[PDB]
Amino acid sequence: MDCIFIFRRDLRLEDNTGLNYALSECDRVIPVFIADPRQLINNPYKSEFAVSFMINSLLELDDELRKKGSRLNVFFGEAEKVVSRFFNKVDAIYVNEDYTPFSISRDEKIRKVCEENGIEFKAYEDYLLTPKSLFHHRNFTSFYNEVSKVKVREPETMEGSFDVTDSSMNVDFLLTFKKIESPLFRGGRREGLYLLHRNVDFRRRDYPAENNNYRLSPHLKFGTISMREAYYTQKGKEEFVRELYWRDFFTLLAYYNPHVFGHCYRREYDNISWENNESYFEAWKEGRTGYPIIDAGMRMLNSTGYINGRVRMLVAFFLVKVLFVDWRWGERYFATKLVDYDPAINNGNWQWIASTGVDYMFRVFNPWKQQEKFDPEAKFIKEWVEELKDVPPSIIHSIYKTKVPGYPSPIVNWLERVNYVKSEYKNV
């Protein structure tokens, strides 16, 4: 048959489930990418960094296609409407299903349009490491132990034929949306594999100053490499593989509990009276809070669109349990900066930290203790907080006692706040 494959979040030609079936089931396959205005224009949850990474990855994907006497066929508009106008005469349409409300309804509409035109619509599982039917767990540890026993499908690629549509635009069109690139990523599968092979001490992955994180999230989220590939390449590293499974967990959690997008996983907490002091929130986004480690984190994130998991949760903790600001505010702000923004993964993590999610205990961290343990030399802090650039570490770790020039002193006492926020939770 003459069919179409629509890329979305699986920006690669290797080990792409839906693409594989498409290549083996039809004679010619037209590789398509649809620039959707609901995602690229006036998206409150849009990240400029994430977009650049996607565009760059889309540019790289286009090269791989040209090396096969084809090219990426680009269209513009809402997915369902695009299919409707341009593909009404194609045989079938292949894709990889996703798990968010937006994605689910978008595919339902494409399905309707497909039935009323005689186009076969085939969606396949690809983003997850495990089959979705296998989910039915309260917490992560329960999930991992049960599902990790299952065998991960091995990467594979089918041979086929890539065709083109003269009408369609080409990747050049997408350059309008690439406005500001992360100095820390370049996108594409080639960079992805390079990162996948750096040998780091994952053991010390908590220390920001060190370089022990693979920085693979954006590549996994946008699919320059498959979940299965990351898995087999690192199969021997238990720590990394278990963390890889956290992606599946949060995705599936959201898939089976759509209400997380807008409400608390544990609904009762939808009654918390967030102080939401717009003033503190503004200080948090600018990294002008009085805590060095928190300031360093936000500042890095702002200019880079990335921060390791340790800083990520310290920052999230501080906004929710110390400045007492609704986690949804932080969720949205992050969605705005993360080069690796993933709706379900971002949501899952925020709720976890705000303890309105999968973690049922009311977890608390000591900013100063934390700061001093994971950045003993204050190297990370000095790298991102301009003003403390020359203050000796010893002082920085106690900067609440002093008051260096140009650096605001703590905007609140975390201890008193955390106690109040908790009482407010128990109150509920």
Residue-wise DSSP of 59-96: HHHHHHHHTTT---EEEES-HHHHHHHH-TT-SEEEEE
Q: How far is the CB of 89 from ligand FAD (least distance, A)?
A: 22
- Amino acid (1-letter code) at residue 51: V
Q: Which two tokens stand for residue 174?
A: 């997408």
Q: Which is nearer to ligand FAD, 44 or 405 (CB)?
A: 44
**DSSP 8-class letter at 11:** -
Q: Which is nearer to ligand FAD, 3 or 307 (CB)?
A: 307
Q: Which is nearer to ligand FAD, 78 or 387 (CB)?
A: 78
Residues 268 and 258 sit within 8 Å (Cβ to Cβ): no
Q: How far is the CB of 401 from ligand FAD (least distance, A)?
A: 29
Contacts of 397 (CB under 8 A, 6+ apart): 292, 368, 371, 372, 378
Q: Which is nearer to ligand FAD, 105 or 279 (CB)?
A: 105
Q: How far is the CB of 411 from ligand FAD (least distance, A)?
A: 20
CA dihedral 392, 397, 399, 401 (to 10 degrees): -120
Q: How far is the CB of 50 from ligand FAD (least distance, A)?
A: 4
**Residues near ligand FAD, by CB under 6 A:** 8-9, 34-36, 38-40, 43-47, 50-51, 54, 98, 100, 102-103, 205, 213-217, 220-221, 243-244, 246-247, 250, 261, 308-309, 312-313, 316, 331, 334-335, 338, 340-343, 345-347, 349-350, 353
Q: Which is nearer to ligand FAD, 247 or 321 (CB)?
A: 247
Q: How far is the CB of 344 from ligand FAD (least distance, A)?
A: 8
Of 373, 354, 374, 349, which Cα lies nearest the Cα of 364?
354
% helix, strand, coil for the chain, step of 5: 50, 5, 45
Question: Rounded CA gap, 17 and 22, in Å?
Answer: 9
Q: How far is the CB of 21 from ligand FAD (least distance, A)?
A: 18
Q: Which is nearer to ligand FAD, 102 or 392 (CB)?
A: 102
